[PDB]
C-alpha cells in the first residue's frame, strides 16, 4: 500500500491511496485503501489520512474516521488521536501498520506500530526528509 | 503548503536491507516527493498533489501499488485505490482492478465523472477508458521480487 | 430478554399511493421476517443466526430490494451487496456486485466464517459461496415484474 | 436495501444488511451496505446498526461508525446519536435514508428522514410491531 496527503496554499486538504493489496491474498479480497473512512480520508475541518497495514483491522476499526471523530468529538489534536488509534486500538485488535496524516494547520504525523514504514514529507520551505525505520 | 507520502508499512526487514537498497528506497521516495512538490510549488491543488505523488509511487517498482504490485494467490494483480477532497468530502475509489497504469487516476476519474465514491469490475474499467487513462499488460506491473515473494509465500 | 429489529428499506411507496392491499401485504412480509428471527432467538440461537435468518427472509420476500425483488441495474441485471458483523470482536464478512447466490447475506457470513477477510467481490466471492455449498438461483428467481417496470420507467424518464 | 439487528439474552449484538442496490444503477457502483462502519456495524460495547438510503452519503459520513463514535467518545445515547446523524448530518449533505439500531441494553431506534421505512421489531416477551410510515 502507498499513499499521499497534502495541504494546499489555502489550507485545503486531500488524500490518495493505492495498493496491490497483500501477497498471496485470496482473489476478490478488498482492504481499507478504497474505503473512505477506513484507509483513505479527507475533511478540511480536521485532517487528511492515508493508511497502510492489515486492511481488515483498518476496516473493522474505521481507523481514518475514528481519528476524524476523535478530533471533532473530543477536540483531540491529529497527533493525540492518530497515535492512540495506531498505538493502542490497532494493537488491541491484533493489527499491524501505520498512517500518514496532515491536519488543517499543516501538522504532519506518520505513526506506525511495526518495524518501519517507507515515508517522507516536503514543506513549502523546500525542507524535506525520507525515512524507512527511525 | 505541505505534502506527506508513504510507500507502505510492509518494509523490508533491517537484516535484509542493504546500503544500496536503502539508498534506492530513499531515491524512489525522493522522486515521489518531487512529483507532489512540483504541483504544490506551482500553486496546484492538494488533490493534484496527492494524485501525482501516488501516481509516482505506483510508477516506482519498489512500492506495492501499480508497478511492483504484489500478486494474488492465483498469480494475478488486484489493485485498489481512492482519492478524497476535504472541502466537500468528495471521493472516488476502485477495487479489484488490473489494467489502468495508475489506479489512483481511475479513483479520481470515478470522483470527477460519476456521482459514486466506489466502483469495481468492468464498470470501473469503463470509466478509465472514458477518461482516456493508459492501460498496461501484466508485464508492465511484474517485478521479479514480488513474484518470488508469492512463490516463497506459497511454500506454506 | 432477547430482541430483534428489521427493515426492508427507506425507499417506501408514498402514503398517498399506498393501497390497503399492498399495505397489508407489506406488514405480512415484515411479520414473516420477524418470525424467522424470533424462532432463532426463542430457540437460544446467536444474535448472528437471528440477523442472518431475518435478512435471508427479507431477501426471500419479493416486496423488498434484496435477493428476490432486487432492483435492476441500467443494463437489466442484479448486482447484490451484503454484510454481517458480530459485536463481540467486531468480526465481519461482506460481498459486493454478486448475482446467483439465493441469499447474499449467507455469502457475507460465509466470508466472515471461512476467510480472514471482511469484504470480497466478483468471482472470488462466488468461489466462497460454492465452497460454503450455498444455494444458487437463475435470473428468473430474482426477477419481479414491478422492479423490471420500475427500471423501464426510470430509463424512459431519463429521455 | 434490507437489514436486521439483534440483541441476545446476554446482550451480545449482531447486524446484517443485504441489497439489490439501486434502480438503473451504473454497473460497478458499491454503496454503504457491504462496508462495515458505513451501512453495517456491530460492537457489544455500544450498538448494532443496519442502514438504508443514498449509499454515497452513508459512505462519506461513515454513518454507522459516527453513531458508535458519538456513543463512545461523548457518552451519547444510541437515540441521541442516531437521530442527530440521520436527522441533521445526513440532511445537511443532501442525503435521504434511515437506520435501524439496537444498543447493548436493548433500546431500539429506527430514525429515517424520508417518506417512510418498512420496519418492525419483536421482543423476548413475544411483543411485536411493524411500521411503514410514522404510525404502527
Ligand atoms: Na509501485
Ligand atoms: Na427480497
Automatic annotation (TrEMBL), chain A:
Source taxon at top rank: Bacteria
Active site per UniProt: 1
Residues reported to bind substrate: 29-32, 52-55
Protein name stated in the entry: Isoaspartyl peptidase
Taxonomic source organism: Roseivivax halodurans JCM 10272
Residue range from the parent sequence: 178 to 310 of 310
TrEMBL record, chain B:
Domain of life: Bacteria
Recorded GO MF terms: hydrolase activity, acting on carbon-nitrogen (but not peptide) bonds, in linear amides; peptidase activity
Keyword DNA repair tagged: no
UniProt keyword terms in alphabetical order: Autocatalytic cleavage, Hydrolase, Protease
Protease in keyword set: yes
Bilayer-crossing regions: none
GO biological process: proteolysis
Name assigned to this protein: Isoaspartyl peptidase
Organism, as annotated: Roseivivax halodurans JCM 10272
Lineage of the species this protein comes from: Bacteria, Pseudomonadati, Pseudomonadota, Alphaproteobacteria, Rhodobacterales
From TrEMBL, chain C:
Domain of life of the organism encoding this protein: Bacteria
GO biological process: proteolysis
Single GO MF annotation: peptidase activity
Keywords: Autocatalytic cleavage, Hydrolase, Protease
Statement: the UniProt record of this protein carries the keyword ATP-binding: no
Protein name: Isoaspartyl peptidase
Amino acid at each position: 500500500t502507498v499513499g499521499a496527503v497534502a495541504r494546499d496554499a489555502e489550507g485545503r486538504l486531500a488524500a490518495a491511496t493505492s495498493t496491490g493489496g497483500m501477497t498471496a491474498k485470496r482473489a476478490g479480497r478488498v482492504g481499507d485503501s478504497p474505503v473512505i473512512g477506513a484507509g483513505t480520508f479527507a475533511d478540511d475541518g480536521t485532517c487528511a489520512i492515508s493508511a497502510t497495514g492489515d486492511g481488515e483491522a483498518f476496516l473493522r476499526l474505521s481507523v481514518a474516521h475514528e481519528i476524524d471523530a476523535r478530533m471533532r468529538l473530543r477536540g483531540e489534536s491529529l497527533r493525540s488521536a492518530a497515535e492512540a488509534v495506531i498505538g493502542s486500538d490497532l494493537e488491541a485488535i491484533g493489527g499491524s501498520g501505520g498512517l500518514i496524516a496532515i491536519d488543517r494547520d499543516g501538522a504532519i504525523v506518520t505513526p506506525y506500530n511495526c518495524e518501519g514504514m517507507y515515508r517522507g514529507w516536503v514543506l513549502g520551505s523546500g525542507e524535506r526528509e525520507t525515512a524507512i525505520y527511525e | 503548503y505541505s505534502l506527506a507520502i508513504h510507500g507502505g508499512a510492509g518494509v523490508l526487514p533491517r537484516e535484509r536491507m542493504t546500503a544500496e537498497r536503502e539508498a534506492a528506497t530513499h531515491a524512489a521516495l525522493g522522486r515521489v516527493l518531487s512529483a507532489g512538490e512540483a504541483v504544490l510549488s506551482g500553486g496546484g491543488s492538494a488533490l493534484d498533489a496527492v494524485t501525482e505523488a501516488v501516481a509516482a509511487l505506483e510508477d516506482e517498482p519498489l512500492f506495492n501499488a501499480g508497478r511492483g504490485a504484489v500478486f494474488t494467490r492465483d498469480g494475478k494483480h488486484e489493485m485498489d485505490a481512492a482519492v478524497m477532497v476535504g472541502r466537500d468530502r468528495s471521493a472516488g475509489a476502485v477495487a479489484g482492478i488490473c489494467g489502468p497504469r495508475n489506479p489512483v487516476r481511475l479513483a479520481r476519474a470515478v470522483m470527477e465523472r460519476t456521482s459514486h465514491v466506489l466502483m469495481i469490475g468492468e464498470g470501473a474499467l469503463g470509466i478509465a477508458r472514458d477518461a482516456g487513462l493508459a492501460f498496461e499488460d501484466d508485464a508492465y506491473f511484474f517485478t521479479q521480487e514480488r513474484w518470488d515473494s508469492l512463490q516463497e509465500t506459497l511454500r506454506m
